[PDB]
């Protein structure tokens, strides 16, 4: 096959510019993202149980069908999250399982148990969707100067905007923050005792008109935190400016005039305290949360989201903008940038090493063009097997490289000796060569190709992060024998002159270079020949590095990926249950102020009402976009510093928490940046204990050095009132439930609910997580309630109410009552450390509570539990490839003692830069295994070929060394530069970068510098040990 290119040139080049067209047009037509999808199929259950508490919900709705879907197709893990409102269900499924199959195997088993289900339930609908729920854009819109309406502007956000923004490919769902607006009225102390009008005078006037109420601090007129009654309105509605709400007659006067509204109480209309309440850079807005749809690309839908965005804005009055405060998608052009940078520098890198030793112009671009013909090709490859350009595939690029130019440079240096050292025309030169080195050429792409399948074999998102680096290298190693076959055959007979191959030119740096590598040489000679002299006395210096692998190996800590400052970042601002949102938007405003007035922040979103651990009243959280990159060029300016400041200055503030995190680089896999720790119940101890466990475990984090920040990702109990009911005699003195329901409901709105019932009781709860006034369980005694024959009875003979705590929410994780958990690992300290130490604490925790690792923790835990396995057979199948290929069960031997010298780079480059063992480490460990086999069977394949025997081979294996100590040297030196760009990385991006490359660098330098003294060594113990 080789000599068919060296005779037909013409054959040659028009193949290699059929790929770099296919390559081309493989690039316009190619998507742009960050990372691959990672996302796992994930179907959620979502029903709503109105009127019903969360005990309740769980018992009837989550738990029924929660139990039935135990034994699904690749279940990964269940959660259930049952509230007042609803119960949800999220069901994470294996990867690689389709969607569409989950979604209808969930809903085949929701047929089965749907009849024990309550009606109502059923009825308002039991939906199954294919979960994305995580957020990666935020439009507001605001008023410049006073356009600001509150009906307006929350209308034109959700309607107009909305509208068009569902309509626009890659959307998902779309959420509304700030558009759910009530009248609010505060009634006045004085002027209704000067009337005779009581609170319920007002409460039920106002009901006759708007049957929206939320009451609260009804009972606290005269210092209100919350409006005493809240009406929400809508524009359907008969009564919608105040001045109509005002007009409402309570009473007539004896003079016959009448007494209104407006006459005993301030009417005002805004924004709901029970909705969402949104703000962007202290001014208020409507917020809109955009989660694209599954599977679409983030780039491509957020530059549709503004192009549709901006094409409505010119229909905006004036005043009225949309700003984008918050776009994860902004990240992918600058990562995709600097990586296309760091690829032309590497380009830039090994072109010098490769002129540095063969000198002249021609014989350096022969392999050069090697590479972009390569990385084209595998860039036709990826468009087709279903791969885009994200920062993995383009960092494999990186590493290709220099590994890309290694059968080329073997072409070219030796038709290059063959064409000084023996005066061949530049035609037999090439031929001759590859007679000779084809099954070089052969064995190293045997081993590096091969090395690279397993990985692409193995499950998790891990498995499709290392899929994307084992095809990107493979198939560009691959690539690389053929162009090394088919290419550069060509290219050498035709372009290199009689006059290139001199082997001393250009006296001077070069000439001095050309001696002192060849007086290097020499010395290797020797030095080698020494410790083939003591062989048994250095093979114990070979155990005595090995077992320093081993100690490096048990003394790194390992990681997932590195913190990277992806310019964006979000805020828990949370209340204890029971706090109004008056505290809470104050609480948000001290936070808002202290990044206005101290931190170099763009945009910062706050949306109060909702949060990732729940909403409510009590929640809020904020979303930040930094300033660019080049006015941070600081170590206290990174998102880290940064995050790590807001949390001190605020941990001095009590009852409240400030909790401030860097954006997760992987959301689909976890809407927060941390451990996702789930404390189970797998013993049925009861919520009691499982408090006790929690809480002292949050303790003993506390004390421990490793941890930051670990606390219930989640709402503590909130007061509220319950109520029994023994021996419903209410119906036998006359008075009926309904007549009850409503009289409670009228004064406490939805917050009046049901709960568990037992015997003849039927037991209520007022919901007092929003921490209004309103009616004291003394009050609810003493209200009245009419009988069938028309008299005010007092409450108190049916009623016996009690003040108490309760979770708002119940959570359930693989079918246990479950307790979120979350936190990070301490400066310094790595993220698996602080899962060690997690479960260190759990030890002495009582007897039945367990633990489970979720989301991106779930992940990580798998990576480091799997990955001996990953490293066994990667060698393992070199070990049988070189074995199929030579025949031999002692030819591998000898190679494979070649990686432990490798390894040890890695591990002191790390070790030694402080770097954690992330995937990027091991994906480096892999590409390091396969260059150490093919330094080694590159000597090893010479000395096997030249002569064999037994009684020690010393005169083939140091004639080997002698020949491929300059190949193996071009080769490892040219990856070294290729990836010193990575392991030297300076800016935005950078994080990735330094982690891929440092590995790999500390790696390729001793698996050449201690693989050339050692190798010939193997190669002798192992023929003279197997005679």
């Not at 030169?429 to 190709?449: C, D, E, N, P, Y």
């Not at 995190?661 to 451990?675: E, I, K, R, V």
């Amino acid at each position: 096959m080789a000599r068919f290119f060296i005779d037909r040139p013409v054959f040659a080049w028009v193949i290699s510019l059929l790929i770099v067209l296919a390559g081309v047009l493989a690039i316009r037509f190619l998507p742009v993202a960050q990372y691959p999808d990672i996302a796992p199929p994930v179907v959620n259950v979502s029903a709503s149980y109105p009127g019903a508490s969360a005990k309740v919900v769980e018992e009837a709705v989550t738990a029924i069908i929660e139990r039935e879907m135990n034994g699904a197709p690749g279940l990964l893990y269940t959660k259930a999250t049952s509230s007042t409102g609803q119960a949800s269900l999220t069901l994470t499924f294996r990867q690689g399982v389709n969607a569409d199959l989950a979604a209808v195997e969930v809903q085949n088993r929701l047929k089965i148990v749907e009849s024990r289900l309550p009606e109502s339930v059923r009825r308002d609908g039991i939906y199954v969707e294919k979960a994305a729920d995580s957020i990666q854009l935020i439009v507001t819109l605001t008023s410049s100067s006073g356009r600001y309406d509150a009906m307006e502007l929350g209308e034109i956000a959700s309607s107009n905007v909305l509208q068009a923004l569902r309509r626009v490919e890659g959307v998902g769902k779309v959420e509304t923050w700030g558009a759910e607006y009530a009248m609010r009225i505060w009634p006045d102390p004085a002027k209704l005792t000067s009337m005779n009008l009581s609170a319920s005078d007002l409460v039920n006037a106002v009901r006759r008109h708007n049957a929206r109420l939320t009451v609260g601090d009804i009972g606290n007129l005269g210092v209100p935190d919350s409006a005493p009654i809240s009406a929400t309105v809508k524009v359907d509605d008969t009564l919608v400016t105040p001045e109509q709400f005002g007009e409402i007659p309570l009473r007539i006067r004896a003079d016959g005039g009448a007494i209104r509204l407006r006459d005993v109480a301030r009417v005002e209309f805004g924004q709901s305290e029970y909705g969402f309440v949104s703000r962007v850079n202290q001014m208020t807005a409507t917020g809109l949360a955009v989660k694209m749809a599954p599977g679409s690309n983030a780039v491509a839908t957020a530059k549709r989201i503004r192009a549709t965005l901006d094409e409505l804005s010119r229909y905006f009055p004036e005043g009225v903008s949309y700003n984008i405060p918050y776009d994860t998608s902004a990240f992918v052009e600058i990562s995709i940038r600097k990586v296309v940078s760091t690829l032309l520098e590497a380009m830039l890198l090994v072109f010098a090493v490769m002129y540095l030793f063969m000198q002249n112009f021609r014989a350096t671009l022969i392999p050069t063009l090697v590479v972009p013909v390569a990385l084209l090709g595998t860039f036709t490859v990826m468009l087709g097997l279903g791969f885009s350009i994200n920062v993995l595939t383009m960092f494999g690029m990186v590493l290709a490289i220099g590994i890309l130019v290694d059968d080329a440079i073997i072409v070219v240096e030796n038709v290059e000796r063959l064409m000084a050292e023996e005066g061949l025309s530049p035609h037999d030169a090439t031929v001759k060569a590859m007679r000779q080195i084809s099954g070089a050429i052969v064995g190293i792409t045997v081993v590096l190709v091969s090395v690279f399948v397993p990985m692409a074999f193995f499950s998790g998102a891990v498995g499709n992060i290392y899929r994307q680096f084992a095809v990107t290298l493979a198939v560009s190693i691959g690539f690389s024998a053929f162009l090394a076959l088919s290419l550069t055959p060509a290219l050498c007979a035709t372009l290199l002159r009689p006059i290139d191959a001199d082997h001393h030119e250009k006296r001077g740096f070069f000439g001095w270079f050309n001696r002192a590598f060849l007086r290097l040489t020499g010395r290797y000679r020797n030095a080698v020949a020494g410790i083939l002299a003591r062989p048994i006395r250095w093979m114990l210096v070979y155990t005595l590095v090995i077992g320093v692998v081993a100690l490096l190996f048990v003394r790194l800590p390992q990681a997932f990926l590195p913190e990277e400052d992806q310019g964006d970042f979000m805020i828990m601002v949370m209340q204890p249950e029971g706090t109004p949102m008056a505290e809470t938007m104050a609480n948000v405003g001290d936070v808002e102020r202290y990044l206005a007035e101290h931190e170099p922040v763009a945009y910062a979103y706050a949306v109060g009402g909702f949060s990732l651990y729940g909403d409510g009243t009590s929640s809020a959280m904020i979303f930040a976009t930094l300033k660019d990159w080049s006015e941070r060029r600081e170590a206290s300016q990174h998102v880290g510093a940064i995050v790590e400041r807001i949390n001190q200055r605020f941990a001095g503030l009590p009852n409240r928490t400030v909790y401030a995190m860097n954006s997760p680089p992987l959301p689909d896999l976890g809407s927060t940046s941390g451990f996702d720790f789930r404390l189970q119940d797998r013993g049925g101890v009861g919520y009691e204990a499982l408090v006790k466990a929690r809480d002292q475990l949050l303790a003993r984090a506390a004390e421990d050095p490793r941890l930051a920040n670990v606390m219930f990702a989640g709402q503590g109990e909130a007061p509220q009132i319950r109520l029994d009911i023994d021996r419903r005699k209410a119906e036998t003195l006359g008075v009926s439930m309904d007549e009850i329901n409503t009289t409670l409901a009228v004064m406490f709105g939805s917050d009046y609910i049901g709960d568990f019932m037992h015997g003849s009781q039927v037991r209520k709860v007022v919901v007092q997580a929003d921490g209004a006034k309103r009616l004291g369980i003394d009050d609810i005694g003493r209200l009245h309630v009419r009988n069938e024959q028309g008299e005010m009875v007092p409450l108190a003979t049916f009623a016996k109410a009690a003040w108490t705590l309760g979770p708002p929410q119940l959570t359930r994780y693989n079918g246990y009552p479950s307790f979120n958990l979350e936190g990070q690992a301490a400066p310094g300290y790595s993220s698996g450390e602080a899962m060690q130490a997690m479960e260190q604490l759990m030890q002495g925790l009582p007897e039945g509570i367990a633990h489970e690792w979720s989301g991106q923790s779930f992940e990580e835990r798998l990576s480091g539990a799997q990955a001996p396995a990953l490293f066994a057979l990667s060698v393992l199948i070199v070990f049988l490839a070189l074995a199929a290929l030579y025949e031999s069960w002692s030819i591998p031997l000898a190679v494979i003692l070649v990686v432990p010298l490798g390894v040890l780079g890695a591990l002191l480059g790390v070790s030694l830069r402080g770097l954690p063992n992330d995937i990027y480490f091991k994906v480096g460990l892999i590409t390091i295994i396969g260059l150490s086999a093919k330094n080694a069977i590159l000597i090893i394949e010479v000395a096997k070929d030249h002569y064999q025997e037994g009684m020690s081979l010393l005169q083939a294996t140091l004639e080997a060394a002698r020949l491929r100590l300059r190949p193996i040297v071009m080769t490892s030196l040219a990856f070294g530069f290729g990836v010193v760009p990575l392991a030297l990385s300076s800016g935005a991006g950078s994080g990735a970068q330094v982690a891929i490359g440092t590995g790999v660098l500390g790696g390729i330098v001793t698996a050449t510098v201690l693989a050339v003294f050692l190798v010939p060594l193997f190669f002798l113990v192992v023929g003279r040990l197997f005679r």
